[PDB]
Amino acid sequence: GGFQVVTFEWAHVQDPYVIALWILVASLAKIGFHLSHKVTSVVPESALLIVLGLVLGGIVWAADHIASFTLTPTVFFFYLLPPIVLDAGYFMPNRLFFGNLGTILLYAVVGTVWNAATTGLSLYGVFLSGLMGDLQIGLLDFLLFGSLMAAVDPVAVLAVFEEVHVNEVLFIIVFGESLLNDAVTVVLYNVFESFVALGGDNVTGVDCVKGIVSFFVVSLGGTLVGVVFAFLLSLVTRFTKHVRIIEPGFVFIISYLSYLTSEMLSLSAILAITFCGICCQKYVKANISEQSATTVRYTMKMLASSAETIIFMFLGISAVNPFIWTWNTAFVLLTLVFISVYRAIGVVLQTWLLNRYRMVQLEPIDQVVLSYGGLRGAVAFALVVLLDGDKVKEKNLFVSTTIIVVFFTVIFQGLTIKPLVQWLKVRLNEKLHGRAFDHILSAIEDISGQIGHNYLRDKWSHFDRKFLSRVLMRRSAQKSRDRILNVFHELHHTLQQYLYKPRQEYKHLYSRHELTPTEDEKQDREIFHRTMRKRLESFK
Amino acid sequence: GGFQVVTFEWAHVQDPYVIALWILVASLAKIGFHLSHKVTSVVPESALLIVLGLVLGGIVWAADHIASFTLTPTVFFFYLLPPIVLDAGYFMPNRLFFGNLGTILLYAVVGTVWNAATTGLSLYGVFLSGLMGDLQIGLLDFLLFGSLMAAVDPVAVLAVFEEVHVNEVLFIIVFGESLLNDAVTVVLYNVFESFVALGGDNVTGVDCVKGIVSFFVVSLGGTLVGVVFAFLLSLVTRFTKHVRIIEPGFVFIISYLSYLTSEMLSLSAILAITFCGICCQKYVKANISEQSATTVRYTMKMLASSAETIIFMFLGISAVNPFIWTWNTAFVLLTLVFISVYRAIGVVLQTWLLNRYRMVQLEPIDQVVLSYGGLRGAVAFALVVLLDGDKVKEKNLFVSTTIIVVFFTVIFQGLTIKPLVQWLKVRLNEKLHGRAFDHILSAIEDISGQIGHNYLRDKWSHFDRKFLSRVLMRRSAQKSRDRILNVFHELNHHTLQQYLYKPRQEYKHLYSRHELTPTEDEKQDREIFHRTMRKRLESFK
Amino acid sequence: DEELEEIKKETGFSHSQITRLYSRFTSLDKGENGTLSREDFQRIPELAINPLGDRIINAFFPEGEDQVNFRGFMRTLAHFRPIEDNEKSKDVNGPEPLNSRSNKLHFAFRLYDLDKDEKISRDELLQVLRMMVGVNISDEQLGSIADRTIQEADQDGDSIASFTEFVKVLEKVDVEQKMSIRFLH
Amino acid sequence: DEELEEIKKETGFSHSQITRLYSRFTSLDKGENGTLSREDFQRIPELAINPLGDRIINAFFPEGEDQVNFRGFMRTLAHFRPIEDNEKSKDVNGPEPLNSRSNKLHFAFRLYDLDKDEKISRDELLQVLRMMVGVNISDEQLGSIADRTIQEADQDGDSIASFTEFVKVLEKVDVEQKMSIRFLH
Numbered sequence A: 001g002g003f004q005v006v007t008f009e010w011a012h013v014q015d016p017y018v019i020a021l022w023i024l025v026a027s028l029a030k031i032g033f034h035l036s037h038k039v040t041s042v043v044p045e046s047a048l049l050i051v052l053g054l055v056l057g058g059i060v061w062a063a064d065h066i067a068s069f070t071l072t073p074t075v076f077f078f079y080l081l082p083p084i085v086l087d088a089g090y091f092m093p094n095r096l097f098f099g100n101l102g103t104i105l106l107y108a109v110v111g112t113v114w115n116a117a118t119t120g121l122s123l124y125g126v127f128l129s130g131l132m133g134d135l136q137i138g139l140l141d142f143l144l145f146g147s148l149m150a151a152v153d154p155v156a157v158l159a160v161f162e163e164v165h166v167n168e169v170l171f172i173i174v175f176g177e178s179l180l181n182d183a184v185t186v187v188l189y190n191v192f193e194s195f196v197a198l199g200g201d202n203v204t205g206v207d208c209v210k211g212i213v214s215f216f217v218v219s220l221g222g223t224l225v226g227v228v229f230a231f232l233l234s235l236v237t238r239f240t241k242h243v244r245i246i247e248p249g250f251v252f253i254i255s256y257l258s259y260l261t262s263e264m265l266s267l268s269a270i271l272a273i274t275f276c277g278i279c280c281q282k283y284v285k286a287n288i289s290e291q292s293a294t295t296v297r298y299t300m301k302m303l304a305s306s307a308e309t310i311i312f313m314f315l316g317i318s319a320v321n322p323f324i325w326t327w328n329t330a331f332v333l334l335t336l337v338f339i340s341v342y343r344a345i346g347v348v349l350q351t352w353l354l355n356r357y358r359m360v361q362l363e364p365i366d367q368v369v370l371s372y373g374g375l376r377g378a379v380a381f382a383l384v385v386l387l388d389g390d391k392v393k394e395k396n397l398f399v400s401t402t403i404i405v406v407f408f409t410v411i412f413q414g415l416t417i418k419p420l421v422q423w424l425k426v427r428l429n430e431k432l433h434g435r436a437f438d439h440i441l442s443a444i445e446d447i448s449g450q451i452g453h454n455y456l457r458d459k460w461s462h463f464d465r466k467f468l469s470r471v472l473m474r475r476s477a478q479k480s481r482d483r484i485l486n487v488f489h490e491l492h493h494t495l496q497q498y499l500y501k502p503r504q505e506y507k508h509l510y511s512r513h514e515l516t517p518t519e520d521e522k523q524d525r526e527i528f529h530r531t532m533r534k535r536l537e538s539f540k
Numbered sequence B: 001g002g003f004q005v006v007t008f009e010w011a012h013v014q015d016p017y018v019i020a021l022w023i024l025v026a027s028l029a030k031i032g033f034h035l036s037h038k039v040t041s042v043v044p045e046s047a048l049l050i051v052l053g054l055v056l057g058g059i060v061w062a063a064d065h066i067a068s069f070t071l072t073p074t075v076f077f078f079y080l081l082p083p084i085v086l087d088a089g090y091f092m093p094n095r096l097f098f099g100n101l102g103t104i105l106l107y108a109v110v111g112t113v114w115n116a117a118t119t120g121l122s123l124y125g126v127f128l129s130g131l132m133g134d135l136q137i138g139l140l141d142f143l144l145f146g147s148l149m150a151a152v153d154p155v156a157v158l159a160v161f162e163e164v165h166v167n168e169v170l171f172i173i174v175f176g177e178s179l180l181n182d183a184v185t186v187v188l189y190n191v192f193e194s195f196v197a198l199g200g201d202n203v204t205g206v207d208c209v210k211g212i213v214s215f216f217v218v219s220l221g222g223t224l225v226g227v228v229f230a231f232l233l234s235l236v237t238r239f240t241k242h243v244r245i246i247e248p249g250f251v252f253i254i255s256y257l258s259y260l261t262s263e264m265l266s267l268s269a270i271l272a273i274t275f276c277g278i279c280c281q282k283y284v285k286a287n288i289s290e291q292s293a294t295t296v297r298y299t300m301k302m303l304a305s306s307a308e309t310i311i312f313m314f315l316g317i318s319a320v321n322p323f324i325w326t327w328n329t330a331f332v333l334l335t336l337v338f339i340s341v342y343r344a345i346g347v348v349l350q351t352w353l354l355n356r357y358r359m360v361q362l363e364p365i366d367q368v369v370l371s372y373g374g375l376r377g378a379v380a381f382a383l384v385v386l387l388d389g390d391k392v393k394e395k396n397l398f399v400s401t402t403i404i405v406v407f408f409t410v411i412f413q414g415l416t417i418k419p420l421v422q423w424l425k426v427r428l429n430e431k432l433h434g435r436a437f438d439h440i441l442s443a444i445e446d447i448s449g450q451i452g453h454n455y456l457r458d459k460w461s462h463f464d465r466k467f468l469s470r471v472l473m474r475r476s477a478q479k480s481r482d483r484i485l486n487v488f489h490e491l492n493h494h495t496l497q498q499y500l501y502k503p504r505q506e507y508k509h510l511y512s513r514h515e516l517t518p519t520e521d522e523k524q525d526r527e528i529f530h531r532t533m534r535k536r537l538e539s540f541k
Numbered sequence C, D: 001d002e003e004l005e006e007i008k009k010e011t012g013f014s015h016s017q018i019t020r021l022y023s024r025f026t027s028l029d030k031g032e033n034g035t036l037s038r039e040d041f042q043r044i045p046e047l048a049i050n051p052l053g054d055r056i057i058n059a060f061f062p063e064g065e066d067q068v069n070f071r072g073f074m075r076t077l078a079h080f081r082p083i084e085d086n087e088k089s090k091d092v093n094g095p096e097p098l099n100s101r102s103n104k105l106h107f108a109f110r111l112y113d114l115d116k117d118e119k120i121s122r123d124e125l126l127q128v129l130r131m132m133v134g135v136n137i138s139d140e141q142l143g144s145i146a147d148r149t150i151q152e153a154d155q156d157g158d159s160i161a162s163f164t165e166f167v168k169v170l171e172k173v174d175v176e177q178k179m180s181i182r183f184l185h
């Protein structure tokens, strides 16, 4: 009762201890997971995190500490979401992203609004027919559910379906849509949650018109804030030639400040830190040192893996909470049907529309991995548990259905997308001349200059080299760059593993959990050297 | 009143926004600071952070948001302190630290207990004489103040006094004491804060005996937890040859888990993460890839510089708070005198005791940089604002005196230690033969093998190479290491100044907490090693 | 509108396709020579990345000449139009189209046949195999590939992949799809 | 106790200092030969780091011999004992001590004089300057340093740094402090 020499005090170190245990156990499970290529080529890593979150939630339930864990909006929206989005936006291949900006936008904004509106309205129409039965629910609740339920993550299944089907435009669609619909879903989530605050009778026609105007203003203002802060981040790294240690700190602090500045102006915070990473990419990591750029990209997978791990551990903690488990036969089995049917015909319709104005069509196999690439994961789940439990009467049913859909998509669709794609796409001279045909086409598609946004790429490169590089790149770097530009201005299965791959078939990967540098860019540099050695034959 | 298209919502993004602004503004001020060597060689960077914290606190006071900022114990002790201590312990030169373990311990444990006890008791004796006057204060409050006030940071002034006086043993004393007395101060802080909870009448003799036992149990148990977790961290990186991306995550998560495990067992959490970094150093960064080891050490200066920045921003905010300002002439001007006089004679007495059993004496110039290396800063200040405002009646006076002492030490002593040392230590053949004499001595001091803990270094190296490396290093790494050991076993005026090799004793080691400072004199070691090995090939063996 | 009409008959394009390709041509004509040279094609950023890029560029120009005008651009660029089945099922007059399957096959062939011999020797095939296979491979493996290719294709005894054998060995490959392009309007 | 007494008289150490240095010697004697060789010294981890380490090791051994016993170890190791003033002010008999200032000077000298000529030529000084100056320096600068050193030290005309000139040029340096060691007890 006096002075205690030592006191076991677990309640003290209990939040940080459990969070750090989550991250550590996920990292150990990643040690086990990536051990064998026979696993990482079959199981999406999101499935590992979801199963591990289930197991750790089972431990939490055994310890009877379910009520100790709550995901709060100020934590997800300020600390758990920014790292994920910044990681996605900082590893975005800029040339592919901007050469396919319209396609990504159509799959990510119209595709999300299509999925959200159709799922919400179809569930509401089912509800009006009495199939669900005696749910105290309204139209805005259904639209909120549909909006959060459109937060697909098809890039989570990228590393596994690209064992059997590689297409670098489909990669950027999957990766762009994964990232830009987090923004669009959160925009729709905020709009319909503001509507839920007002109520199904307080929302007038002008309120809905302001909702539409808010969608566009929020999205575009967030993008603009992100571009401004990417300019500022590119600029500040210009002046860190001497103090090179603070450069990784700048990339994360200024991206975070873009996120919070948009969240301060009520703009799209996700789009701000998305484009603070997409746009800072060229000049950051040109001004940053080599040693300080590995820190920036090891820390981005460090922050995003940890953030996604925490949300997936919370998914497990809720997936074992027996007080949120509300199972409505119709609701669950029609959410599964609607989000899958409407995703399929949404992709089919958008791909048909895009293919009318494309030089390389999106073949039905590309549309298949988009339709089967629901993979609803962290963002989707988090947006459901962050719902207001009293403003949305049937929130527990939403959480249960979202957990069920997260598991169904990530585990059933995430695991069977590789067998399915490999099923749907089912001799030496044949292969050699086929590769020659592919290389001819990627030259004709290139000569005609209708693949990228070539006119705007040319216009940007002129503006980048003459104006932007003068303010965002160091003087000596400008001199070296112009010297380099001046000196370059004068200028059966064995066979399969030997041939060059066509530019269209580079195996790009984004993992959020490991660094996956495109190992086919080595081909580009090898051939460039071979042609330049051939360009020295003229002796010019 | 309906649905708003856009709403300016600053109260929402207000804590993370201001914290990120703090870090960003400090980083920009570091862009300015390190621009000219004429500044970084004169001003300790801690002084930059303190002045910048003052300026940003002036902005906060202008905006009238002083009451919005509070440093809470769960934030300092769980998020702000671990990065600083882990950074210090992970960049500790292990050979110097362990070859001088006893000297560092004497300067860091006895030196802290001496400083704490003497300052606390001298302030209490002054208070009993009525000079301070009408302070509702007791002995335990004074001892708590003395304990937190012994949290010196002499490594903060290292980069500037080593422009004029380099000594790699004094570097490890300054760097070891900076790090190990954060532990000892926090141990004493916790002990005397538990006593303050009980009160000046509830503390009995057995309570004080348990206090002493708690000091030792806490310190040693924290060290042991740290060693266990450094074993675990070294072990887990053995298995990350394939998944190399999670290695920097392991170094920080497992060090943090050591910190919290000691904080869970009520042990010294600082000593746990100190020794989780000191001990993991060899095998971590042997198993980690080159690319993943730069992340570990760029992120450690990233987390430590940010945490110290954030504590110094709180110092600035508290320093402009006009409701915490309590100025007792006697208390302030005697805290300044006592912490300076007792530090001086504490170093003089300890150095005299150590010099009785040393092969290289600590010259009076070394004792000078230790005595003038108070530089009380982040830890000292934070431990004061974390005091219980009602259990310690005169807490505002403690905060005011600690702020005044932080400023006096870091700005006055931190800036005038380079002129002072350079004042206190105030021809071609002279210099050449002097360097030859230095090189002869560092060989005789080496042949006789009384400098390091050579017997224990030998014993450890035997145990490390035969047993520990078998479990903490990868098999192929063990095979490569033994092959390398086998192939190396067969081979068992100012211009002149800038040209000569420097003696091993005079390598300019630096630790900054704000920048990576690799010892650039280790290049000399490798150059000479290659030259002698090329001379060892002359035998053709 | 007449100029965009002779091109339409000779090639098969639409007026808008010809207009867009003319805009691309005049953009490619940095130098404004009214025609287009080897280095104007070489100036394209990602043709130097193409393993077969130089053969493509050479194929754009007629043998002997060292320049191409817009009509030649369109002629050599019209082999990559897709064929529509209902078109050839409607007005059956002759196998003229420059985008016929044999014409795409002949384009790739003339890439293989740097001599324009109408027959691919072992040397020509080995040269193109080298040009489009990573440097790491041993030239012994590459020669094995080349001679095995000729042997499995030259079902005649001449040890040459002549044109008729090319079509026969490619009778299994959908040339009509993997060398067809939706040129934009 | 007699064995630790002849060493005490010859060198000047204490019994405990001799005992500790004997323990270090027998630890250095991996191989247990009763004596100690060049490679036993070379086996010390941070003598190979010393720019002058090899000269030190050679100085430990007598000229001609290739081994040293404990008595020789202590003889060559006693030059680095400090001198106490009250000791030499008490019993003034002779300048015998192996730790006298001239003896430390002579030790460093014999390092410079690899020939043991008693005089340092330009070649010997240049050799030691090379051995203890970074490789980046030009040998022209190094020769300038060597010859300037001899000229500023050899106040005689022989272009050699002979021993008496060494002491004269070092009359300003506290040899007594920067080459003295508190050997532990």
Ligand SMILES: CCCCCCCCCCCCCCCC(=O)OC[C@H](COP(=O)(O)O[C@@H]1[C@@H](O)[C@H](O)[C@@H](O)[C@H](O)[C@@H]1O)OC(=O)CCCCCCCCCCCCCCC
Binding pocket: A099, A100, A101, A102, A103, A104, A105, A106, A109, A110, A113, A114, A349, A350, A353, A354, A357, A358, A359, A360, A450, A451, A452, A453
């Ligand atoms: C069936 C869908 C329902 C009707 C559409 C709904 C409104 C969308 C407005 C027009 C949609 C289609 C735009 C016109 C056709 C089109 O695709 O040319 C294509 C453009 C641009 O496509 P790209 O940039 O990829 O260029 C490629 C190609 O040119 C080629 O050269 C290469 O093959 C490739 O390599 C290049 O990259 O695509 C785009 O511009 C896409 C525009 C992005 C829209 C942003 C969202 C704003 C819409 C309103 C939001 C509310 C939701 C509505 C409710 C459902």
Ligand SMILES: CCCCCCCCCCCCCCCC(=O)OC[C@H](COP(=O)(O)O[C@@H]1[C@@H](O)[C@H](O)[C@@H](O)[C@H](O)[C@@H]1O)OC(=O)CCCCCCCCCCCCCCC
Binding pocket: B099, B100, B101, B102, B103, B104, B105, B106, B109, B110, B113, B114, B349, B350, B353, B354, B357, B358, B359, B360, B450, B451, B452, B453
């Ligand atoms: C005037 C001081 C007041 C009295 C001391 C208080 C209790 C401390 C116990 C003994 C202190 C002194 C230890 C014996 C003498 C000593 O220094 O040999 C030295 C030892 C070890 O020193 P080193 O390891 O550096 O070896 C060097 C050398 O041998 C040499 O070879 C090379 O020159 C060098 O290069 C090597 O490194 O030093 C040590 O062991 C230091 C021990 C560390 C103490 C830990 C703290 C526990 C004490 C109680 C805590 C409560 C506080 C008390 C109230 C004030």
